Amino acid sequence: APDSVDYRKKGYVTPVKNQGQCGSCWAFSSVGALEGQLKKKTGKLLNLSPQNLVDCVSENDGCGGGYMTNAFQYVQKNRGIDSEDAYPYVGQEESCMYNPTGKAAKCRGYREIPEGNEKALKRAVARVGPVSVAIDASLTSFQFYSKGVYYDESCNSDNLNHAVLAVGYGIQKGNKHWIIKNSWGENWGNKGYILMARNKNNACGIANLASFPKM
């Protein structure tokens, strides 16, 4: 039987979130990866705080964009990241208000998958769990997605502009794919998710900026 995994079935994925009017996709991607590792390492997870990252990761630009590795590094140096409940998302950057009392996860580093390698990415998803990735999500066809395995030849792998989360991989109707968790609400795509073409020459640059935190 062909290799495939869907971490949503295993309880490694929390409900789909909505960024609102803030370019915080990176924060949600990071938090999603941390959540997956919490489930993996401790047997249970909870919603982590993307707001904590938006406000405290000085190396990023808050609602103006950021990198997942920068967030992981921050969680590590900071000795922690608050839970969503302790540090709720307001969708706008504010002053860093982290509080150790509400710490909900820790990080011991991170690893970046070899750029452009879907085979290494697949191994990471299979051996680590959900991984943070970035893609070109500017196409109109990406935005109005609803079903099937998305693939658009004009998707620019050299223009990563949206962080997302690879929650698994498989095949649907002879079409190999990556299971992708977005942060545009459950209203977007298929209940907040999108099936993206796998092994279609790094479509949309799916393997160009992938990483996972070490816990």
Ligand SMILES: *C(=O)[C@@H](NC(=O)OC(C)(C)C)C1CCCCC1
């Ligand atoms: C989306 O939420 C943001 N994307 C982002 O941080 O992209 C990386 C650096 C490729 C992960 C941006 C922030 C504002 C401009 C548009 C989308």
